Every structure is written in structure tokens, then in C-alpha cells.
Amino acid sequence: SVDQKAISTIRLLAVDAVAAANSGHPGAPLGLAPAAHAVFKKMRFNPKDTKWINRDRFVLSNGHACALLYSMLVLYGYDLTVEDLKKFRQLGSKTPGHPENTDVPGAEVTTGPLGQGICNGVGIALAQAQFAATYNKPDFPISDSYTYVFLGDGCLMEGVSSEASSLAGHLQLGNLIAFWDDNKISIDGSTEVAFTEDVIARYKSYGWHIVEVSDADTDITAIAAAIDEAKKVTNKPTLVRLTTTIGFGSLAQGTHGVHGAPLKADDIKQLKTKWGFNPEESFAVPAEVTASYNEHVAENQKIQQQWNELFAAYKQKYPELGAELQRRLDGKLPENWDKALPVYTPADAAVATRKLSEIVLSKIIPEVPEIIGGSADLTPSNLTKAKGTVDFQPAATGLGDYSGRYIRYGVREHAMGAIMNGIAAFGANYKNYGGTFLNFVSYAAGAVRLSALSEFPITWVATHDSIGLGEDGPTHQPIETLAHFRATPNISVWRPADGNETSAAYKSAIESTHTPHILALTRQNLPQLEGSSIEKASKGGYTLVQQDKADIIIVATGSEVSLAVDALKVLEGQGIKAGVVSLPDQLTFDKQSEEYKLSVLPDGVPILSVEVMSTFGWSKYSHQQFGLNRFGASGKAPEIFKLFEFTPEGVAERAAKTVAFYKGKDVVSPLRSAF
């Protein structure tokens, strides 16, 4: 049949791509081609409009199998060709060794790090449910799309997928349909050596529906029926067990050797001949297959055409909601939304930046409907919920509704991070956030790094940023954490010092379209600073206290800016004149003009950094660095600061030593470099 020919075409494109590269993973593509064929036939998508908001989404969580995904996208006429497949895994190609949403048309997310994709799918489905609950009306199914995920044994072993699957079951996400490639093979061999759990029983314990397909090597009728069955179960996510043979058809099928290395040339020849292809030909695309696939594309395009008319009719009947939806699909925030940001003066009371964050969220959530977010079981400590909002829950629970805006993630930081990526990936201008303690953002590093690589505007509300948290002690107090994330490309790491800086941090986080944000916020109260503003803090770094005859400039962040200002007063008594720079985001600062940056960190004056955590990175901005490069302590926070000499007198002492160290030396800005 043409279906059989399509499946063979997919299999052989994937194997030929791997062969051309002499690198990559043929096994799972061979095993999953029947399922991929069946799922893509059920999916609604437009290869010529990858951003249609009511498309079904597909996620390849087992991202190493990407030769499969690329083959589907090529066959369906996405902006990806056979010539791109011939450049699989080659420098600069549109067919990288794992899929990247920034590079591959039709890749919704970036996968390859196991476990992430299924969690991203949970997020896409969460967003779809929230979006549909917000906009759909009688006779106006604006959003009714599904989220299809392929995953393997590796994803099922990674703890992040357990977190997300538990939560997805709790959230009754009926439009999520995941497919487990049950092939009993991972890199170390049989799953019998390390993975003997009853996966199906575990998924039932989370509240998922199960469908089993015992011969997924051939039975596309049963795979299609499993999708139909899943669609009838509207209050549970579904796991479809696909029992497959890894490398199906290969001489080496059912072995770990077929997982991750090119097939032998003679193996590829026998594959081709057994399936009716020419063993002398590579990258064959039978025109029957193209035609069949084009039929499905044409049908899908007519569905999108009708959706566009539905949307026009919706704007007529529901003018307010229609305009809001249009704005969001155009990628634009509400006009002058930022007028809602709180502004402070130096006469206002001291406030912890976690509390300032709560206040910002309380003002901006009502103004910007595309903001949703949650906390990983730290809502009353992170202060991440705006009073009066309702939680995102299935209405059946009585605990919230899908139109809700606040997500109870539970103690699941890693899944929260990957779910945030999925919510961003959904689109419709979602600006989504997740709260935990800064030290436990580290639990989610796998996902955070992908936020940066994927260019997703997600936001971590990362409270309890330092030894300032006090008694919980060194297991809770960040040391390395800011250095880690600042060293990752494309992460804005805001550490606001006061009310105005906190508003600037949120302005940046919400306006972001391509850069994830981490907001490092305090437990302890900080004063409102003389000289701060949203405008100045929006530059990432700025001169807080200008001293035209400075003997030294002190550059600081967050809680240490007030400390630097107090140190300036101590220094004045010692006959030393200091300026103060506040550097609430190093990335934003780095992006300013060379002239702007030199106005903040000039030549001809020693510069001392002060921040109560690692000194790594700080030499970009300073000549000497006062930081904390050891673990913290359990005690009252002011006593910990005193112990480590983060006091006005301790900073002044180090400032004075810095001035003395550079006496009779020529000093140039830390911004200067040889190349």
C-alpha cells in the first residue's frame, strides 16, 4: 500500500541521513516510523505556517531519533529539504544531531537531553488548556488542539519525566497523548539490567489512561485507533505503549548496537531490497508518498483557512476578547502595560525584593492576561501568587479552573522549568514564571540551559538568594548559582537592589522574546536607594552614586548595593572618595554600547566588586573582588554577614587596600581587552 511505502520511505531517509553523516542514531527511527506515519496523518498542521495557533503539536522527547523527525518534515514540505537531510549533523546545517527549535522549521522545542521533551509536552498541553478556557466560546472553538509526544526508555528513567507525569495526571490534561517506544533497549543493553519497573502500573498510579499496541512494528490501524481512544478520554492524559523492535528491519534489529551508530552498508542494501527500494539509491522519495502527504497538507490548510474565518467571526461577536487575542498572536504586549509597574522613592520603607516581586505581580497580572506562573511548593515563601487570582486546576477538582493563572507545581523544580519551556513554546505571547529558592533552581539546570539555547522568554522568581536568608543554613544558601547561570549563554540574571530595580527586572522579563530571566530576590528587607529608577536599572548597570574625584568605584548587586553605599560613608571618614555602581543584570549591561559601559566603569580608577557569593565572572567589571567562595552557615543573617566581614567597615577595609594596591600604577577599565 501507499501507507507501507511511506513507512519504508521514512525509515530509509533516516538511515541514509545517518549513513551520509557517518554519525547518528538509526535504531529508534526504524522502530518508530510506523507510529510517526500514523500520528502525523492524525495531526493538523500547516508546513507553510509553523505558527498557526490551533495546530496540533508534536514533540520528539527521544531527540536522538531526530532523523525520523527531519524525514517527516521533509516529506510534508516544511522548509526543510532532501538536500538538508544530506547535510545531517554537518556544520551549519538545518539538520543538527539533536533538534533545535531555533534552527529546524517544525521543531517546537529543543530536545536531546533526555526527559525534557515529555515535560515540554506537558507545558504545551497546559498552555493549550489555559488558552482554550480563556478564549473559547459557544460555537467558537478557537483552541482545540492536541499535544503528541514520542518518548523512550531513557526519558522514562529521568526523574524530570516522573515529576511532569505526576503533575499532568493531577491536572487531568486530556489533550496530551504520549507514546512510549517500548523496545526494551537502551545504550547499556537490555532494559532488564536497570529498568524493570512496571511502567504501565506507574502511569496508572498518576491517573493516566493507557492504550497498549502490542505490534507497533506493523499495526498502524491499532496506532490510529489508540489516538481515537485517547481523544475520547477527556480528563486524563494518555500513554500509548508502542511495542517495537529497535532498528526494525536491520540485520542488527533488537540490539543496542543499532541505537547510536550508522548501519553497515550491506545492512542498508538488504533493507532497501526487502522493502522494494533500489539498494543503489539513497534519499529516495517515491512520488506516491509525496502525493499522499500533500493530500493531508491540503486538507489541513483548508482547516486552517476555516479557522481564520472562525477567528474573524469571533472578533465580530466578541470584540474585546478578539482584539486581545489578535494582539497576542501579533506578539505585542498591551499598550503602555508598564505604567502598572510600581515606582518607589528613597522616602519609602525598606522591603525585601521577594515582597517587591509580589507587589509587581499583583499590579501586572491584571494588566497582562498572557502572564501565568506558579511555584514549586513555595507560594507563601516566594510570594508568587497575586491575591484574588484562581489556580490552574481541572474544574472537576473544585480547586481551580483551566482559566486560572496560578500553577501549583509541587516540589518539582526540574519539571517546572521544562513545563515553563513548553508554555513558552505554545506561543500566543505567553510570559510565564516559576518560583523557587535560588539554590534549588540548580535542581532544574537541565531545563534552564535549554531555556537559554531555545531562546524562550521564561522567568524564574528565585527568592532567598544568599546567606541573607539566615537560619536555614548552607544547604539553602547560594554560592555558585549566579556564576553558573551567568556563565551560560543567553540568561539574564537580575539581582535587583530595591523597588525600582525590581520593577526594571520585571519590565525586562516580560518584554523578553528570546532570553530567559532569573530574578534573584531577597528574604531580608532592603532600603529604597537614592539614585535608582526603572529607567537607569533598565540599562543593566548604572552609576548610582557619581563621584567625579573617585579614588575607587564599588560595583555591587542586590543586597550589597546598600552595603556599598554605607561603606562609602565609612570611607569618607578615612579620606577616601568612592563612587557606587549598581549592576542588576550583567547580560543587559553587556549589551549596552561600549561608550555607555565606559561611562559606568571608566578608565583611571580602581574598581572593587561586592556580592556575597562567588567571585567568578566579576573580573569582567572590576580589578578586585570581594565575594564569598566558601559555603554559608546556619544562624541569624546579620551575624553571618558580620562573620564574613560583609559590613560597611569590612568593605571599606578592602576598598582602602585596593586603593593602596594601585598607588603609582596605571589603571584601565576592566572593560578593556586585548582581543
Ligand X SMILES: O=C(CO)[C@@H](O)[C@H](O)[C@H](O)COP(=O)(O)O
Q: Which residues are catalytic?
A: 413
Separation CA 663–CA 275 (nearest Å): 81
Ranked by CB distance to ligand 8EF, the top (closest) residue is: 154
Strands 185-186 and 189-190: antiparallel
Give yes or no for residue 183 binding Ca ion (CB under 5 A).
yes
Which option in Ca ion, ligand 8EF, a copy of itself, none does residue 23 bind, with CB closer than 5 to 8 A by kind?
A: a copy of itself
Give yes or no for residue 417 binding a copy of itself (CB under 8 A).
no
What is the rounded end-to-end Cα distance, in angstroms, of the chain?
Answer: 62
Q: Which residues are annotated as a binding site?
A: 25, 64, 112-114, 153-154, 183, 185, 259, 354, 381, 413, 440, 464, 472, 523
Q: Which residues bind ligand 8EF (CB under 6 A)?
A: 27-28, 62, 64, 112-114, 152-154, 181, 183, 185-187, 246, 259, 377-378, 411, 440, 443
Least distance to Ca ion, CB of residue 195, Å: 9
**Are 241 and 212 in contact, with CB atoms under 8 Å apart?**
yes
φ, ψ (nearest 5 deg) of residue 294? -60, -35
Q: In this chain, which stretch among 47-55, 85-93, 563-571, 574-582 interacts with a copy of itself, using CB under 8 A?
A: 85-93
**Are 102 and 111 in contact, with CB atoms under 8 Å apart?**
no
Q: In this chain, which stretch among 34-42, 182-190, 228-236, 296-304 interacts with a copy of itself, using CB under 8 A?
A: 182-190
In the bound state with ligand X, the residue whose beta carbon lies nearer, of 262 and 322, is: 262
How many residues in the shown chain lie near ligand X by CB under 6 A? 9
| Number of C-beta neighbours around residue 387 at 10 A | 7
φ, ψ (nearest 5 deg) of residue 262? -55, 145
Residues 457-496 that bind ligand X (CB under 6 A): 472, 476
Least distance to ligand 8EF, CB of residue 539, Å: 33
Give yes or no for residue 405 binding a copy of itself (CB under 8 A).
no
Give yes or no for residue 408 binding a copy of itself (CB under 8 A).
yes
The residue within the footprint of ligand X, chosen from 37, 44, 57, 64 (CB under 6 A), is 64
Least distance to ligand X, CB of residue 187, Å: 6
Give yes or no for residue 153 binding Ca ion (CB under 5 A).
yes
Least distance to ligand X, CB of residue 375, Å: 10
Give yes or no for residue 253 binding Ca ion (CB under 5 A).
no
The residue within the footprint of ligand X, chosen from 241, 449, 523, 536 (CB under 6 A), is 523
The residues facing 212 across adjacent strands are 241
Binding mask 145-184 for ligand X (x = CB under 6 A): ----------------------------------------
Strands (E), 485-560: 492-494, 517-520, 525-526, 542-545, 552-556
Of all helices (H) and strands (E), which one includes residue 637? helix 637-643
The residue within the footprint of a copy of itself, chosen from 49, 51, 83, 194 (CB under 8 A), is 194
Kindly report each contact of residues 250-258 with a partner whose C-beta sits within 8 Å and lies 24 or more positions away, as own/partner. 250/26, 250/27, 250/30, 253/30, 254/183, 254/185, 255/185, 256/185, 256/186, 256/187, 256/188, 256/189, 256/190, 258/26, 258/27, 258/30
The residues facing 435 across adjacent strands are 375, 461
Least distance to ligand X, CB of residue 595, Å: 42
| Number of C-beta neighbours around residue 77 at 10 A | 15
Give yes or no for residue 514 binding a copy of itself (CB under 8 A).
no
**Are 213 and 242 in contact, with CB atoms under 8 Å apart?**
yes
Give yes or no for residue 377 binding ligand X (CB under 6 A).
no
Task: Please count the CA atoms within 13 angstroms of the CA of 143 that sit on its side-chain side.
Answer: 24
Query: Where on the chain is the footprint of ligand X (CB under 6 A)?
Result: 64, 112, 187, 260, 378, 381, 472, 476, 523
